[PDB]
Every structure is written in structure tokens, then in C-alpha cells.
Amino acid sequence: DTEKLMKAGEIAKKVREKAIKLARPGMLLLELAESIEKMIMELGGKPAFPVNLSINEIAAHYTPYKGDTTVLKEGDYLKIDVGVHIDGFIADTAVTVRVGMEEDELMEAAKEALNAAISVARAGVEIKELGKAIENEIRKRGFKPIVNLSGHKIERYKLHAGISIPNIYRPHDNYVLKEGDVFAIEPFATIGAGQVIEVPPTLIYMYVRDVPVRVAQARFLLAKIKREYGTLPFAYRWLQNDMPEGQLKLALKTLEKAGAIYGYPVLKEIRNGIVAQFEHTIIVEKDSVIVTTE
Ligand SMILES: [Co+2]
Numbered sequence: 001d002t003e004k005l006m007k008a009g010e011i012a013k014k015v016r017e018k019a020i021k022l023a024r025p026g027m028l029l030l031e032l033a034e035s036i037e038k039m040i041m042e043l044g045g046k047p048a049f050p051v052n053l054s055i056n057e058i059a060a061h062y063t064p065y066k067g068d069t070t071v072l073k074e075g076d077y078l079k080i081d082v083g084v085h086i087d088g089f090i091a092d093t094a095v096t097v098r099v100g101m102e103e104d105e106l107m108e109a110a111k112e113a114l115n116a117a118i119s120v121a122r123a124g125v126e127i128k129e130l131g132k133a134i135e136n137e138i139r140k141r142g143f144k145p146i147v148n149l150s151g152h153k154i155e156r157y158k159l160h161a162g163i164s165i166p167n168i169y170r171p172h173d174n175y176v177l178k179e180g181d182v183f184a185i186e187p188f189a190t191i192g193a194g195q196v197i198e199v200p201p202t203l204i205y206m207y208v209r210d211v212p213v214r215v216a217q218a219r220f221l222l223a224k225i226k227r228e229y230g231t232l233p234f235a236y237r238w239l240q241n242d243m244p245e246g247q248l249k250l251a252l253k254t255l256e257k258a259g260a261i262y263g264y265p266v267l268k269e270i271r272n273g274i275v276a277q278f279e280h281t282i283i284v285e286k287d288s289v290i291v292t293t294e
């Protein structure tokens, strides 16, 4: 279904743009996310996942927690990733911002990557064409694409769904773009290496599997998890009050170990090189594409 998808787009769109506006030095991340997640629900959206406010060397998979006194300092490169869905049709967008400052050529690189990528996409294109297009844009400005962190196919209630949209030309990325395919195209660019690493904390999670749990407490959480969130990612923070202190963190850890949920840790540039990201969701047509998030 297109329109549902398109609506998701429209909202992701505005919500993003508003997030840009709020993003000044001193602004509390926690607050920001909360504003952003609200404005979604306001417009008749629900999140596809918590807003990912990632700063600098941090590349993805940061979304704050209650007591997260992270505030933006001027000159910080802020990645904003915003998820919205409408009966499970997803729009997924992301923009880098350098706080209280103008567009940097790091930012330019990622941005033009996306555009270039959109440009060459049509039904019947081989994925690598978009790879090359992005590789090209970033290297050519003296910069390094992040190679293990890219776009991805999208489906109904499926944020990542088979096929990645790489930021490098590789010769056996041959998936031929079907007409109707939905896809996030995220280029990341960097001054460091082009390679990211898992580091704690682990702040986003996902229901993966109905498995049985020994401990009463965790089992009831898994119910509230499936109920309020299903197959979509959800922040730590959305669950916070419901329990005592580290009683939640633990309960979450018990569930990981059991195989019921997965924990998305925080991705950081291998060499703390600063990182840029722009993503649009798109949909394929014979001879062009719909850009759900402009
Ligand atoms: Co995303």
C-alpha cells in the first residue's frame, strides 16, 4: 500500500524538519527525542523506532534514556534518524546537522551521495550502481564511506529485510531493483577509517522470538514488549518507570540471553573519526523513484 507509506513519509519529513529547528547548542537530547517522538504521534504516526540522535564519532543506534544529560555543544555533528509507520508501512529518514554552524563538505559528501544514489535508481538497476555513485561522491571529496553500515530494503513491519544498499562498488551486489521495492538509502561518510564498532551501552532493542522464560518478572515484560511494540525496535527509555532501578536493565538482559529479544548496541567509528549520514526512504518505478521523505 502506497498512500500509507507516503503518509509515513510526509510525517517523517515534517518531524525531521522540526528536529533540525530544535537542534541548537545546549538542547537536551532526552527532551529533543521526546519532542520528536510526540510530534509523530501528534500527526497520526507511531514510531518505527526511537529517534537516533548520534553525535560525531558515534554513528547510529544512540537514543537517549531518562537521566541522559547529553546536550548538544556548538560544532557537534548530529545525526538524526527518524522512524515512522502507519499500519506498518515505514518511512525512514535521516539528516546530519552541525550545531550552530553551516554545512561542512563532510556533510555535503553524504548528502550528494544520497542524491546521486536516488538519481541512478529505477526499476532494473543493479544495486552496485548506487554503491559506486556513493563511493564516488565521498572519496572524491577526500572522504571515506562507511562500508559496514548502509541502506537496506524495507517491508511491512520490517525495518531491515534482506538487501543492503551499500556505500561502495562491489561487483556481486547484483540484486536487480524490482518495481515496488521500498528502500532506505543511507550513505555514511567519515574522516576516520570507514568501519564501525559495537560499544556499550545497548539502548535499543527488538522482539525477535516467542521463547519461554523461567523468571516470572521477565516473562511479563516480554508480554508488554510484544503488546506495545511487536517486531519494531523500541528504546530502553520507553519502558523506564514501569520498574525499580536496575531491575529493568537486568530484566532486559535476562530476555536477551533467552533469545527473545536482541539489543542494538551503539555503533561508533573504529577510529573516532566524525561521521555523516543522510537517508531517504524510496520506492521504485519503471524509470524513476518516489522519495517518500522529501
Ligand atoms: Co534509519
Ligand SMILES: [Co+2]
Binding pocket: 092, 184, 186, 279
Ligand atoms: Co536505517
